[PDB]
Symmetry: C3
Subunit: 110 residues, 3 copies
C-alpha cells in the first residue's frame, strides 16, 4: 500500500495545518477498514489512480457527510498526494493541491 519511501514521508504530514500530531500507519489501516464498511475495494488505496477513483466516488457525499466520512476523504487525499510525489505539510495543503489540480483539468478542457 505504501512503500518505505512513501511511509517516511507519510509519517511527517500533520493532521492539522499547525497541529502537533502527524499521520501514522494506523490511519491507513483505519481508512482501509472504512472502505470495506462502505463496500469499496480497499486495494484502490495502493495507487494514485485508485485513490483518484475513491475520491471521486466519495466527493458527492462530502457536503452532507459526517466527521467520519470527511476524515476518510481527507486521509485518502493526503495518500493521493504521497503517491503522486506531491510534497504536502498538512491535510489542508493536500486538499488545496487537489482543487488546484482539478481546476487545471477544467482549464485543460477548452
Amino acid at each position: 500500500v505504501l512503500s518505505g519511501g512513501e511511509l517516511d514521508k507519510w509519517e511527517k504530514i500533520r493532521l492539522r495545518p499547525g497541529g502537533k500530531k502527524q499521520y501514522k500507519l494506523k490511519h491507513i489501516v483505519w481508512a482501509s477498514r472504512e472502505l470495506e464498511r462502505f463496500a469499496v475495494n480497499p486495494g484502490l488505496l495502493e495507487t494514485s489512480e485508485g485513490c483518484r477513483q475513491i475520491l471521486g466516488r466519495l466527493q458527492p457525499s462530502l457536503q452532507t457527510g459526517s466527521e467520519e466520512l470527511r476524515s476518510l476523504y481527507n486521509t485518502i487525499a493526503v495518500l493521493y498526494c504521497v503517491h503522486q510525489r506531491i510534497d504536502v505539510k498538512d491535510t489542508k495543503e493536500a486538499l488545496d493541491k487537489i482543487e488546484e489540480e482539478q481546476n487545471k483539468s477544467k482549464k485543460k478542457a477548452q
Copy 2:
C-alpha cells in the same frame, strides 16, 4: 434540532393524512441515528438549509429505496417544513409543499 416553538408544531403533525399517529421526539431521535448509520451529519437536521441538503442527498435513492429510507426522507421532509415555518397537517402535505418549491 427543534426549538420549543418548532417542537410544539411537530408534535401535532399526523403521520398519515389524516390518521391517529402524530410525530414525536422519538421520530427525531430515530432520524438522527439513521443519518449517522448512513454517514450523514445529523447536525444538518438543525436548520432548514441542512434539511434541504439531506433531502437532495437522499432524493436519487427514493425510487428503489427501502421502507427505512422512504420513512427517513418523509421524516426529514416534515422537519424541513417546520424549520420553514410552513404549517403542515400530515406527511403527505409536507411532501407536496416540498415538491412545489423544487419545481420553482
Copy 3:
C-alpha cells in the same frame, strides 16, 4: 422471490464457470438482507423489472466496489436471468447475456 419452477432453475446454476458450487436459497436470503442494509427495497427482487432497477442503481458502484458489492450485483444479475427465463449455466453467462441484451 422465486416460484418453484424458477427455484429449480436457480439451484442448477453454478457460482463460477464449471465450478462445483451452485446457487441455493440462502444466496437469495443474503442478497435480500444485503439490499436492506444498503437502503434498497428487497421487494424489487420479485420481478424482472425490479431486478433491472436494482442493477441500474448498483451499476455506478461496480468499478470501485468491493468483492462483497460485486458478489451482490452478480447474484441479482443471475436472478434477473431466471426471472427473464434466460438459460444460463453460471454467473459469467448471466453477466454476458445482460450486457449483450443492453447492447441490442
